[PDB]
Amino acid sequence: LTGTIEAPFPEFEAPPANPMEVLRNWLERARRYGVREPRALALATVDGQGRPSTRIVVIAELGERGVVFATHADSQKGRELAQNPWASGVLYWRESSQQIILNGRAERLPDERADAQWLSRPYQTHPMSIASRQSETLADIHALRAEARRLAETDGPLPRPPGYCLFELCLESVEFWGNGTERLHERLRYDRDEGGWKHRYLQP
Amino acid sequence: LTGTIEAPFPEFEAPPANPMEVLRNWLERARRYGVREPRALALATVDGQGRPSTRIVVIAELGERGVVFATHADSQKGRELAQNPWASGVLYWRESSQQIILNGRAERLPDERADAQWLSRPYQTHPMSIASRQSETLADIHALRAEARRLAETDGPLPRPPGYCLFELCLESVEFWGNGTERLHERLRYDRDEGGWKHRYLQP
Ligand SMILES: Cc1cc2nc3c(=O)[nH]c(=O)nc-3n(C[C@H](O)[C@H](O)[C@H](O)COP(=O)(O)O)c2cc1C
Ligand SMILES: Cc1cc2nc3c(=O)[nH]c(=O)nc-3n(C[C@H](O)[C@H](O)[C@H](O)COP(=O)(O)O)c2cc1C
């Protein structure tokens, strides 16, 4: 590992009852430490044959019960999630040698949430998001580029495109992982059932 | 995107026929760019309920047809792979704004390969990999720490522990993603077919 910052993990010896509280604390410190792109989540979805796929998406919002991300409903992750809502993401912060694993069911939020989040983006991002049909075959790159440039001509916000949506990943289990000392990595694992949240430690 | 390096995607316009050639190119360039931990793979595996789980593992070797990583057979990932070999991993390189998605089936290599790999590791790594039962519940961190300290009393190399193994993820489809210009991300997607590999471009 290449981290130079021994990150406090005071939640290891004393675990909060709710994993959302550790997730907030950790993101707050990542911010202080200048962690480069701490919300880049490596997100796994699963196809109808039990075969996973992965890509980076950004955690756009923290909710009470989960993390939210924006994407296109008809992308590959969107098509997978429509038949199998179970997902898992991992964040890995090289600077502080920390990993966070988030497992749960990701479900599509109301249109209004999507409209709000869409319109929160810098309007410069809207052209390609409308022009591209995410994850479909690109037959002509120049055609796509021209469509987006014509859209960029408006020089302001564009309407949310059909299929632009938000999913919320409702947490069913979470692991917080810290480097520890002597390779004894520190693994704090939380789990949920209709009984609620419990935690335990895992061996590295 | 905090991408401090504008990275060309030389293969995008006229791609090689086999994706492993691109992977090797991309990994070699990543090292020369100074990408930090370019082999930290966010690896997804899938339980018997179709629910994915993720974590980081390091690509220990490039095989002829895939990527090799070391782990423990009775870890969560290893229990999951034993019942469903289909797996997916993403590399994300913040500095050059590149991602590589690797999809395939992961199969365990012979003991000889795992022994060689195990023996190539810095010997300080041996104690904990033997003393810990990866991803089992940790009963008592002091006791685990004592056992690894005890093992370390021997000058390594120490013997490979039962269950320490290498998996090779044999590629079935690969995506190379680059940031491109004007948000028109450059996605090159390879799929293993009849007579071997084909590729196409995907929309961002
Ligand atoms: C740093 C970074 C952030 C990204 N964030 C998102 C995002 O939040 N939402 C999104 O749909 N795609 C995002 N992408 C693009 C995805 O990685 C992927 O290319 C696209 O969603 C299509 O994924 P799919 O074909 O597996 O569904 C991001 C890519 C990078 C490298
Ligand atoms: C950057 C880094 C590299 C890692 N490399 C490996 C590795 O190569 N093999 C391994 O078994 N665990 C590796 N780990 C630990 C894994 O993330 C994980 O905690 C462990 O394998 C148990 O995963 P599981 O419970 O999901 O099976 C690495 C962790 C970090 C953060």
DSSP B145: H
Ligand 1 first shell, C-beta below 6 A: A 40, 53, 55-58, 69-72, 75-77, 134-135; B 1, 99, 177
Q: How far apart are CA B176 and CA A148, in angstroms?
A: 22
B186 near B180, Cβ under 8 Å? yes
Give the resolution in Å. 1.9
Cα-Cα end-to-end distance for chain A: 15
Taking CA atoms, B98 is separated from A87, A117, A140, B22, B35, in Å, by 23, 25, 22, 13, 10
Read off the amino acid at residue A108.
R
Kindly state the tokens that stand for A124: 């410069």
| Structure token pair of residue B193 | 């077919």
Q: State CA A154 to chain mean position distance.
A: 30
Q: Is A196 exposed, middle or buried (0-12, 13-18, 19+ CB in 10 A)?
A: exposed
Tell me, yes or no, if A203 comes closer than 8 A to chain B by beta carbon. Answer: yes
Q: What are residue A87's DSSP bridge partners?
A: A104
Q: Does residue B110 have a cis peptide bond before it, meaning omega lies within 30 degrees of 0?
A: no
Tell me the technique behind this structure: X-ray
d(CA A199, CA B22) in angstroms, rounded, equals: 43
| Distance from the alpha carbon of residue B42 to the mean position of ligand 1, in angstroms | 15
| CB contact at 8 A, A55 and A41 | no
B184–A88 C-beta distance less than 8 A: no
CA B190 – CA A57 distance, rounded (Å): 21
- Residue ranges and CATH numbers for the domains of chain B are 1-204 (2.30.110.10)
Residue A83 and residue B10: Cα distance in Å, rounded? 37
Interface test with B, best of A12, A54, A151, A177 (most B CBs within 10 A): A54
Instruction: Give the residues across from B190 on adjacent strands.
Output: B174, B199
Q: Please name the residues in contact with A78: beta carbons below 8 A apart, sequence gap of 6 or more.
A: A71, A72, A134, A163, A165
- Using CA atoms, how far residue B154 sits from B123, B130, B162, in Å, is 10, 13, 19
Reading phi first (left if > 0) and then psi (alpha if -120 to 50, else beta), residue B50 is in left
- Assign 3-state DSSP to chain B and report helix, strand, coil percentages, each to 5: 25, 40, 35
Nearest-Cα distance to chain A for B166, in Å, is: 17
Closest CA to B54 of A145, A98, A52: A52
DSSP H or E segment with residue A35: none
Q: Where are the beta strands (DSSP E) in B74-158?
A: 86-93, 98-108
For B201, nearest residue in chain A (alpha carbons): A138
Nearest to A186 by CA among A24, A22, A42, A20: A22
Residue A121 CB neighbours (<10 A): 13
Q: Strand runs (DSSP E) across A49-97, as ranges?
A: 52-58, 61-62, 66-72, 86-93
Please give the Cα distance from B100 to B41 (Å, whole number): 9
Dist. CA A143–CA A181, nearest whole Å: 54
- What lies within 8 Å, CB to CB, of A100 at 6+ separation is A23, A26, A90, A91, A174, A175, A176, A177
Q: Are B172 and B192 in contact (CB under 8 A)?
A: yes
Do B51 and A46 make contact, defined as CB atoms within 8 angstroms? Answer: yes
Contact criterion met (CB below 8 Å) for A191 and A171: no
Q: Which residues pair with B69 in a beta bridge?
A: B59, B167
Chain breaks in chain A (C to N over 2.5 A) after: none
Phi/psi of residue A170, nearest 5 degrees: -75, 120
DSSP secondary structure code for residue A137 in this structure: B
